[PDB]
Each structure stands twice: as C-alpha cells, then as structure tokens.
C-alpha cells in the first residue's frame, strides 16, 4: 500500500501551485480572445511527416434542461438517433459518437427487430461509437462519487447487454468545470483515455502555452502514477464547430454547414458558410487547414482531434447531408494535395486516442503528469460557475437522500433471490434509473428550467417509493421466522420512519405510533444499518403518548427520552417566527445497536404513568413577552425567560455557548480545556445593480455579505439526557444545534419566501490561524487543500462543497460536515461559510432564460467537529491533500447513511425475529461497503452478487481504536463457488481470486468483487 499522507507526488503539473504562480490576466489575444496569434512553420509537415485530422461528429443531447427529458426525446433524439443509422447505415465511412445512454435505450427499446439489428452493425463495425458510455454525462461538482459510480454502471451494464460493447474512452464537454473523481473511477472501469473541456480560459492559455494540454491525470496522493489516466483537455471556449476546427471563430463557422440559413442559425462573426464546390474548395481547405496546423500547434503529436458538433446537431436528414457533402468535398481536395501534407477523414474518439498513443510508442511525444482538479471555472471575464453548486438546494439534499435509499434497497434485498411477481428488480432499475438520471449536469446542478426541475423531482419522489417498497418487503422476509413468512409482495408490512427528509418545517409527513392501554399497547419498529461495521445511533419516533418504554427483543429495557414536537410558525400576528408545541403526539429518542450490514428490532410499549427507564426533557423557551405554551400530556411544563446567554452539556461531550440570539459562541471540549470561539452567523449576498448579473450558473455578488437583521429572535432550548437542542427563529432560517454527546448537528429550515436577488449565507468565526489556507471535499471522495487567492475575485474563491470542508493551523481544526452539496469558502482566516439558499430575478446568458424564482423550504444538516490536531501525523506544507479524522468521517457517515427506521404497519407481527447479522463481520472504521447488489435474477443456476469495497484515509492522532475482523465480502453470502475482482462497473473480470477469498483495499482505493455462489 502506498502511503497517502507522507510521500508528497512529483508531477509536472500540480494545479494548485499552477494556481499560485499564474497571473489570470483577462488580455484580448486577437481572433483567439483569450489565447494569442498562433504561428507555425509550414515545413514542420511534408511527405514523410503528415498532420492526421480526424473529424468526429457528435451531438449534444441533454437529458433534460430547457425541456424535460422526454419532450426532448419526442421532439429532438429521437429524430437524430433515427436519422443517425439511416445515415450511417447509407454511408459506410460516415462516423458519429454517442454519449448519454439515457436517451439511447430510451430510444432503442422503441425499435422493430429489423433497425435494432441494423444499429448493432454499425456499433459492431466502428461508425456509431460510444463514448464514456454513463446514462448521462454527470455534474461533477456536486455529484457523489457513488452516484457518479451508479450513472457509469446503469449505462455500460446496458450497452454490454444489447450492443455488446464496453467504452474505454470518456468524453465530457458540458459539466462545468472537471473533477479527478472521474479519472480516479474511470481508470478502475477499465478505462484508457478521458476528454474534457471546461476550464478557466486562463488554464487553457497557460497550459496550452506549454502544450500540455495532453497529460496523465493522477491523483492527488498518487507517488507511484498507478491511478493516471491520459487526459485530452480541448483548448477553445468552446466545444462547438466555430470553436473546434481552430483559433479563429470567424473562420470555423463558415465550416458549420447548418448556419446557412434554412435552418435558422448563423454565423454570428457575420461570415457565412458557403457550399464547397469545384470553383472555391482550394480556397476553402487553404482557410480551414490554416486553422488545423495552427490548433495542431498546441499539442505534441502529428494527430489532430477536431470534434464536428453543437447541441442536438445531427437531426434533420438535411442537416447530415450538408456537414458530410461538403466536408467529404474538403477531405478529397486536402488530402490529394501533397503540398497540405495532411490526412484528414471522418474518425470516433477512440480512434483519435489510438493514433495519439502509436505516436508516442513511436517516440514521437512524451506526455507531462499533473494532478489537481479544475474548479472554480470562468468562461470568460469574471464570471467564475460557483452558484451552481448552490442552486435548487432542495434537489441536491434529495439527491443524498435518494443516494442511500438506493444503496439500502439494493444492499437489504441482495440477500435473497427473489420471484419474479415480487418486482424487485424492476424497482430497483427504476430507482437507478431516477437518480442517475439526476447526475445529469443540468440536474443537481439546479440549472434546468422550472417544470423541469419538477419533472426530475415527482422521478426521484417515485424512486423513493420504489426503494421504500423493496426495503419494507426485504425487512419483513429477513426477520420473520421463515416457515410462518408469508408474503403479499403489494402489501406494506413496515412504513419507512424520516426524521430528516422532507424534514420537520418542510412537510408534516411521519407516522406517529399510535399505543393506548385500551388499545394496541405495543408496537415494534425496526432499524437498519447499511454500514459494514457495529453502530449504535440514537433514532427517534412520533408516539401518541409520553409514557413509552422500550425494550430490545430480549426484552431488555432501553434507556430513552420523550420530548415534545415543536414546530416553528411565522406568527404574521405578533410578527415572529415562534415555536408551537404539540399537545397530541410526542417524540421518543433511544439509542439503537445494529449489526454489520444488518437489523435490529426493539419493542415501544404504553404505559399509564412514567415508566422506569424513560426521562423526559426540560423546555426553555427564551422571549420577551412570552405567553404559555401546553404541551397536552407532556408531564413536565414549559420554562420561559428573557434572551440571555446559556451553556450545554449532554454527557461527557463538549459544552457549548451560546449568544442570546440563540447562535453558537463557543465550544469547550472538556471541563478544564478552554471555551473555544466557534460562532455561526447568517449574511446575505446581493446581485448587481448594473453589469453582470448572478444566475443558475453564476455567482456574481455586489461584494461581501452584510448580517442578516436578526431582531430579538425566539430561542427553544431542550434538555434532555440523551439528547439536548437550542434552536432559533430567524428570517428565512430556523437553525438548531443539537447534542446528543458528541459533535453537534446542526439543522437549517432555509426558507428564502420572497427574498428576489438575495444568497443566504451561513458562516462560522474562528480565530483559528489558518491563513488562506482552507480544504474542501471532491464527490465525498476526497479532500483537496485550497488556497485563498486576493488575485481572484470573492467568487473564484468559491468551491463545491458536496459532503465536507474544514479549517486548521497548528493545533487546531473545524470540520464542516454535509448532507448536501452546496457552495462554499473561507474568505479570511478562521472561517468557513457555506451558502444556504439562492434567489435570483434575472437570467445569467448561459441560456437557461429564466432566474431562479422557484425556491422552497429545505432542512440542510451538518456535522460540526472542534478538534486539537497538534498530536495528529498531517500531510507535509506541500501536499496537496488532506484527510480527515475518525470522527469527522464518522461524522459524515451519520449524516449521509444514517440508520434505517420501519415501523411494523399492522397490529401483530408473527413470527418477528429480534436481529440479522450478528454474524456479520464488523470491518475497521476507514473500510465501506459502498455497494452490495445481486446481478442475477432467480432462474439464474449461478447466483453472483457485485460488492464495491473503498477504504478512505483517517489521520493517525494518537487514538489506537483497533481489534477488528477482517472483511471477506466473497464468503457474506453462502454456498460461495467463486470470487472475482472486477471492474467498478462489475463487467469485467480482472482477478480470480484464491480461497475465494476477496482481499481488502488499501487507504484511499475503491476495489468491486464478484462472488458466484451455487
Ligand atoms: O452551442 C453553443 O452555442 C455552445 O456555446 C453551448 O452554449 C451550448 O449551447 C451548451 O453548452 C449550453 N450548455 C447546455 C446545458 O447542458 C448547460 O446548462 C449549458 C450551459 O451553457
Ligand atoms: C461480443 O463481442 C465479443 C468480443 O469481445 C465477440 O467475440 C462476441 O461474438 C460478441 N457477441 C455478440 C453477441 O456478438
Ligand atoms: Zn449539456
């Protein structure tokens, strides 16, 4: 195993001291606005020595965006996939790329016998290839590294199935701005080549300059260069025909054949295309191969990859004919003049890439290492794409919540075959399918229309469905005794139990359990665990009384607490924003142990007075003015006071302050260290008055955040044993923090109403010395050092924040734990802010043509972790990397795969076993199984069931915390005949594996088994 912490990498490239050095000066370079005049020696060629040009068409099919997924494949692909293997087909030496398999299967399964045997020839002889091969093209700022896994896999798994192929070369020209993530997944997948395009014009001209534009992309933490994956970055600023064939727009979009006229689009350079014929060819190619030999001058090889496209191109019949008549015109001319020295011809992606590398085996070419990512990106001037890994809020908190729905119902129903009447299978394809289609960048990212960002919600909504479906089925077959199991696969024998999604402020839709002692006295309830090792979580549930015990199926009592149900009104009477209590249901909180990857259930029983093993919270509401609040049954009454300060402990965790706006002040982490200053404070962001205005994609404030005016805010404060909470009422946020003995949560109800060109921002004050130093997380894989830099403006300081960023200097450190990606930075020493919430009036010419207007209420949550890290061994002043500590990690854990909750739906639950999986293994801390999912239906003779493994890195701080099984995922399941390594996606075998037995991985590496069992 390579050491991730201590062996700093040597690259040629490293992007954030690149980002150091580099001036981004915005200079006018000519006809190339943002690069300079390009020069070549026309002898560089001759006939020994041609430029090979390959031309690859491709169309760019958004699966949602200004039209939902569906009216754009009835209006648009639909027409081009048709009109495409019409085409091909007619036209042997034709090519065409293929990227979101969404869209083709859509369309496949729409096909009679006859075209669908027609399209797997054209696959099978090389004119229609796919590229990358996902169900679409995923965001890769805001998307976790497992949904981006799942996209990749639905997509391959289907193209291996019905075109019989595997892509090994990634093409990705829309997300905006470029992950490592994708290289680091894509090379375990069997991949060998990778193309991206949008970056910070200032990175293009910088590496352009010294043609590295081609480069072997590793990981950050990679010293030996086994995750480098060989990466095309295009150079323009665009991926359209005017920006592709060279420097000069104006001289490419007279190459576009569709800007004609009869098509409506233009040249807006003001020069039109013009057929090519017999009377002016010499004089076209002699512009259009000037352009090539000086885009050929940016790379190293005498291969040339010009790609021939724009968005939803190829459609009309028309249109093939007049991109493919007039260019194979130009090719014929070209390349029978030897004075050109070039040969150019239609070509696919991998075809570019295999020329390129025969080059370099040639000796031809030797290309640099680099490691980094390329956020925060500009297209132009200042307008750097960071609000974007903030917009629609309330879908990227869905997508972490759909994320591990996903994983459970794949992972709780993997341990049994099922019939085919029970519908899993179809379920959990749809569940995939919904969330895949997510990642989609116009999806998470929160820049698609407004009836399409519904469209993806009421999808994802009916993902939930599904998976709580095969969850509740798979929990009811696992824990009733099997000769009394007796299933109606429609039937809800557990309805699912969320205490954080939609959340409590957002939509009242939690079950309460309704007891009474003339009534059903008891009710069992059921908890999951999808991590691979022993948890104990508190969860809590809705009951119709206070006076609830619980016991563990041994009936052995287990300590709990009730507390009320608050709820936060916007009293437009008295105007506050003010908590109300229930007086009809009540809340129980007790600590759940569940096995490995596995259940646990536990009885509430009614009683008619206070039973012996359950406490109850005390209350303190802190107002001027305050009026009684009853609480119906609630046996202890409501505590009212002026604001002031106040401090908490639960357990021996750490003691908070707060201010008397109900905010945190200070953390002391034991009772003699000393009381930390930690505070939270909200600010707002505004948009300009003139210029450029802040959009979906955009953030573009009128300069640094001012307070929010607080007022004289209601503070709730709960105490309790098990768990305490102060929580705060304040304009468009009600913000929690909650203890429960360790690391506080904290939640926000954002609600910006009608706030039009405003950005909620959360910030936390320290005076932790940490400079302009700051560290942010990529697809909650991993965790890049960020610098501050006064070079750049507020908004290139921002950075996604998909699960996690922190702080720290010498001895300290802040880690910022989240359930959803939002943007975020820290824009001066000791702090760290995270946007909440942004609405904006006016549309940023992205084209998308609308603001954001369509806001609504979110719960986000959070972890917050103080820690000392003086003690801890830490990465060296130049490594790029950071990593988190047992608890951070944890911490994100209990945020992003919580425990499970079922409550039995019906009275009696017969046979009812009290767990499964105690005989699970319990695999160190730093090990997931990210993924468990059986491939083989029923009738299938050999079982075989998919397992990703990743092991993450965790700081060495001086806490041993060992004694732990080891992990063999091959032998969960019995009757083993065979164990597999595998490609992430599970398609290909890459090991057979001794004993049958899967090793584990090393820190920081993903690994995919695949057990065959008889
Ligand atoms: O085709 C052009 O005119 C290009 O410059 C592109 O603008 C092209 O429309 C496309 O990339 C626009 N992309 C499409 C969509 O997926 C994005 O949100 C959006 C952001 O601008
Ligand atoms: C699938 O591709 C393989 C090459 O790996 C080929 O040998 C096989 O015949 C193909 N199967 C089908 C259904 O064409
Ligand atoms: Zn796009």
């Not at 943002?34 to 002898?43: A, E, F």
């Not at 994956?229 to 665009?238: G, N």
């Not at 665990?529 to 809590?540: C, I, K, M, S």
Request: with cysteine.
């Amino acid at each position: 195993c390579q050491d991730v912490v201590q062996d700093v990498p040597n690259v040629d490239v490293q992007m954030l001291e690149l980002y150091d050095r580099m001036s981004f000066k915005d200079i006018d370079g000519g006809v190339w606005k943002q690069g300079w005049n390009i020069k070549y020696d026309p002898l560089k060629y001759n006939a020994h020595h041609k430029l090979k040009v390959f031309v690859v068409p491709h169309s760019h099919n958004d699966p949602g965006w200004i039209q939902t997924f569906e009216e754009y494949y009835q209006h648009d692909t639909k027409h081009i996939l048709s009109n495409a293997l019409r085409h091909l087909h007619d036209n042997p030496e034709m090519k065409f790329i293929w990227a979101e398999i969404s869209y083709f299967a859509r369309f496949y399964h729409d096909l009679g016998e006859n075209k669908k045997l027609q399209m797997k020839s054209i696959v099978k002889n090389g004119q229609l290839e796919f590229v990358t091969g996902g169900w679409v093209m995923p965001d890769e700022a805001n998307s976790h590294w497992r949904n981006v896994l799942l996209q990749l896999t639905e997509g391959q798994t289907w193209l291996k199935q019905f075109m019989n192929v595997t892509p090994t070369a990634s093409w990705a020209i829309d997300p905006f701005g470029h992950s490592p993530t994708m290289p680091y997944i894509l090379q375990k997948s069997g991949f060998k080549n990778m193309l991206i395009q949008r970056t910070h014009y200032s990175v293009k001209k910088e590496l352009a300059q010294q043609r590295q534009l081609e480069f072997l992309w590793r990981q950050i933490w990679d010293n030996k260069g086994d995750t480098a994956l060989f990466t095309h970055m295009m150079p323009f600023y665009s991926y359209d025909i005017p920006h592709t064939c060279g420097p000069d727009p104006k001289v490419c979009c007279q190459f576009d054949f569709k800007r004609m006229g009869s098509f409506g689009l233009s040249c807006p350079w003001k020069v039109p295309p013009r057929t090519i014929s017999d009377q002016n060819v010499a004089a076209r190619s002699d512009l259009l191969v000037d352009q090539w030999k000086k885009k050929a001058e940016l790379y190293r090889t005498n291969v040339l990859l010009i790609p021939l496209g724009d968005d939803f191109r190829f459609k009309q019949n028309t249109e093939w004919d007049v991109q493919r008549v007039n260019y194979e015109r130009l090719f014929e001319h070209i390349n029978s003049q030897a004075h050109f020295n070039v040969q150019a011809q239609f070509g696919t992606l991998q075809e570019y890439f295999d020329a390129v590398h025969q080059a370099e085996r040639a000796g031809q070419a030797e290309f640099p290492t680099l490691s980094g990512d390329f956020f925060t990106y500009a297209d132009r001037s200042d307008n750097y794409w960071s609000g974007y890994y903030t917009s629609r809020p309330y879908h990227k908190r869905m997508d972490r919540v759909l994320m591990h729905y996903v994983r459970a119902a794949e992972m709780l129903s993997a341990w049994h075959s099922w019939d085919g009447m029970a519908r899993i299978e179809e379920r959990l394809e749809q569940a995939r399918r919904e969330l895949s289609l997510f990642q989609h960048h116009d999806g998470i990212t929160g820049t698609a229309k407004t009836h399409v960002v519904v469209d993806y919600e009421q999808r994802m909504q009916e993902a939930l469905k599904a998976c709580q479906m095969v969850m509740q089925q798979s929990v009811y077959r696992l824990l009733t005794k099997p000769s009394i199991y007796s299933p109606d696969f429609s039937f809800s024998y557990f309805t699912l139990d969320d205490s954080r999604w939609p959340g409590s402020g957002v939509e009242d839709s939690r079950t309460t359990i309704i007891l009474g002692e003339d009534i059903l006295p008891s009710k069992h309830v059921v908890m999951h665990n999808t991590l691979p090792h022993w948890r104990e979580q508190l969860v809590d549930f809705y009951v119709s009384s206070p006076f609830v015990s619980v016991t563990d199926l041994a009936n052995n009592p287990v300590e709990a607490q009730v507390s009320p149900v608050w709820s936060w009104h916007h009293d437009t009477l008295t105007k506050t924003i003010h908590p109300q209590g229930s007086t009809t249901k009540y809340r129980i909180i007790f600590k759940a142990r569940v096995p490995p990857m596995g259940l646990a259930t536990y009885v509430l029983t009614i009683s008619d007075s206070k039973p012996e093993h359950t406490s109850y919270a005390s209350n303190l509401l802190l107002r001027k003015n305050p009026t009684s609040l009853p609480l119906g049954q609630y046996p202890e009454d409501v505590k009212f006071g002026d604001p002031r300060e106040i401090s908490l402990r639960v357990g021996n965790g750490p003691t908070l302050a707060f201010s008397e706006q109900g905010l945190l002040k200070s953390i002391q982490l034991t009772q003699d260290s000393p009381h930390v200053p930690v505070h939270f404070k909200f600010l707002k962001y505004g948009v300009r008055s003139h210029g450029d205005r802040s959009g979906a994609y955009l953030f573009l404030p009128n300069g640094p955040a001012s307070p929010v005016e607080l007022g004289q805010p209601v503070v709730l404060v709960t105490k309790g044993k098990l768990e305490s909470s102060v929580s705060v009422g304040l304009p468009s946020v009600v913000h929690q923090t909650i203890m429960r003995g360790g690391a506080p949560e904290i939640r926000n109800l954002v609600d910006i109403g009608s706030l039009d060109n405003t950005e909620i921002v959360m910030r936390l004050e320290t005076h932790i010395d940490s400079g302009d130093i700051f560290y942010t997380d990529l697809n909650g894989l991993q965790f890049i050092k960020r610098r501050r830099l006064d070079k750049l403006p507020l908004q290139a300081n921002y950075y996604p924040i998909p699960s996690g960023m922190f702080i720290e200097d010498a001895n300290t450190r802040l880690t910022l734990l989240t359930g959803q990606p939002l943007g975020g930075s820290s824009l001066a020493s000791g702090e760290l802010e995270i946007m909440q919430d942004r609405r904006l009036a006016s549309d940023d010419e992205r084209g998308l043509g609308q603001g954001v207007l369509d806001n609504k209420p979110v719960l986000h949550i959070y972890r917050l972790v103080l820690e000392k890290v003086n003690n801890c061994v830490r990465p060296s002043k130049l490594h790029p990397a950071g990593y988190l500590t047992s608890a951070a990690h944890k911490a994100s854990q209990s945020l992003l795969d919580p425990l499970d909750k079922f409550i039995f739906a019906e009275n009696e639950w017969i046979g009812a076993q009290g767990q499964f999986g105690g005989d699970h293994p319990s695999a160190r801390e730093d090990l997931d199984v990210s993924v468990m999912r059986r491939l083989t239906k029923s009738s299938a003779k050999t079982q075989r069931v998919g397992y990703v493994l990743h092991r993450t890195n965790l700081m060495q701080c001086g806490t041993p915390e060992e004694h732990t099984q080891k992990l063999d995922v091959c032998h969960l399941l019995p009757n083993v005949a065979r164990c597999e390594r595998t490609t992430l996606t599970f398609l290909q075998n890459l090991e057979h594996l001794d004993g049958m037995v899967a090793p584990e991985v090393c820190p920081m590496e993903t690994a995919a088994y695949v057990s065959s069992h008889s």
